[PDB]
RNA sequence: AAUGGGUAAUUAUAGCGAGCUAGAAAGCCAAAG
């Protein structure tokens, strides 16, 4: 639905996607990772340079956090005698792994010629032109290892 | 002095030993629906 079409359509709950404005809808703020720099079928012909030097290919990356449930569930018990194995640490860890992959991934794909098809929980699936997809995951992890101090 | 004979050495030497351009394209399919 569009913005002003909320006057027209009858609903019960409205979900708003990748937004922080208050607005008049009093909606529910979901966070779906999404980006398109172009259509999917143009990413092969976008792999050229300004010279013409590039192979007409498109790359696809599927990222995955390693041992995510093993770091969610147990996670913190290594430091101390176990005095950091609480709900609020894992609830903050719950946000910080969703705040990364569902919001911050569009900043990493700001001007890259790609399309994040899905990013959620641990998993990313992002088609795109091959120079940028290779540059995406190098730029994603080098951010994600600074986000987590090298762990996860 | 005549006369009988040739004898030894070298058997190639110094280099280059490949260079550059192309390294899969276009259809089917998928897209556009
Ligand atoms: N957003 C999330 N936050 C915390 N845990 C998650 C999230 N999404 C999935 N999981 C966890 O991931 C587990 C499934 O394993 P998954 O492959 O998804 O990641 P993993 O546990 O790190 O394993 P792997 O190393 O194979 O990726 C589930 O037990 C679930 O609890
Ligand atoms: Mg996982
Ligand atoms: Mg997983």
């Amino acid at each position: 639905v569009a913005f002003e079409k909320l006057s027209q359509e009858a609903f019960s709950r409205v979900y708003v996607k990748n937004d922080y404005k208050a607005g008049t809808v009093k909606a529910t703020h979901v966070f779906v990772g999404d980006y398109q720099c172009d259509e999917i079928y143009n990413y092969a012909a976008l792999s050229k340079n300004e010279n013409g030097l590039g192979i007409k290919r498109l790359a696809v990356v599927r990222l995955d956090v390693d041992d995510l449930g093993a770091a969610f569930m147990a996670g913190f018990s290594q430091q101390g005698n176990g005095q950091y194995s609480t709900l609020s640490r894992s609830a903050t860890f719950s946000r910080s792994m969703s705040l990364f992959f569902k919001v911050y991934i569009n900043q990493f794909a700001s001007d890259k010629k790609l399309s994040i098809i899905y990013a959620g929980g641990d998993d990313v699936f992002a088609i795109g032109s091959w120079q940028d997809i290779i540059a995406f995951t190098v730029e994603l992890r080098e951010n994600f290892i600074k986000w987590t101090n090298g762990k996860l």
Side-chain angles (χ1 to χ4, degrees), chain A residues 1-20 22-23 27-31 33-49 51-152:
Chain A
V1 72
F3 183 73
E4 56 90 16
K5 263 64 183 299
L6 299 175
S7 299
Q8 295 175 353
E9 297 292 325
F11 64 94
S12 67
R13 187 180 296 113
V14 46
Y15 291 100
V16 63
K17 176 182 69 65
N18 292 324
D19 198 3
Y20 296 109
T28 297
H29 295 84
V30 304
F31 295 103
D34 51 351
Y35 182 76
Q36 289 186 358
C37 187
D38 200 357
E39 296 290 326
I40 287 95
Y41 65 97
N42 296 120
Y43 289 152
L46 287 174
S47 294
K48 260 64 188 304
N49 288 317
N51 306 113
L53 294 178
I55 186 170
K56 283 169 90 284
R57 304 292 172 85
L58 70 158
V60 169
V61 65
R62 189 175 301 173
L63 289 85
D64 190 353
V65 179
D66 294 331
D67 296 337
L68 182 60
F72 179 77
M73 294 177 183
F76 298 99
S77 66
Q78 184 173 1
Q79 298 193 5
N81 292 317
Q83 61 182 357
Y84 295 94
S85 301
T86 64
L87 184 62
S88 295
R89 269 75 171 176
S90 176
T92 312
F93 189 86
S94 306
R95 299 298 300 165
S96 177
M97 294 305 296
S98 293
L99 179 142
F100 186 82
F101 284 99
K102 293 179 180 290
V103 171
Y104 287 175
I105 199 166
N106 297 320
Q107 292 297 109
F108 298 146
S110 67
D111 56 352
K112 295 182 172 65
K113 299 180 292 296
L114 60 87
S115 290
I116 292 172
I117 288 169
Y118 180 68
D122 52 350
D123 182 70
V124 180
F125 183 73
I127 195 171
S129 176
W130 72 271
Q131 298 100 18
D132 295 333
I133 294 293
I134 295 174
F136 178 74
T137 68
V138 171
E139 190 168 358
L140 195 146
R141 182 187 181 270
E142 289 292 325
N143 291 313
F144 185 67
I145 63 169
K146 287 181 70 174
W147 181 257
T148 65
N149 208 170
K151 277 82 69 178
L152 274 83

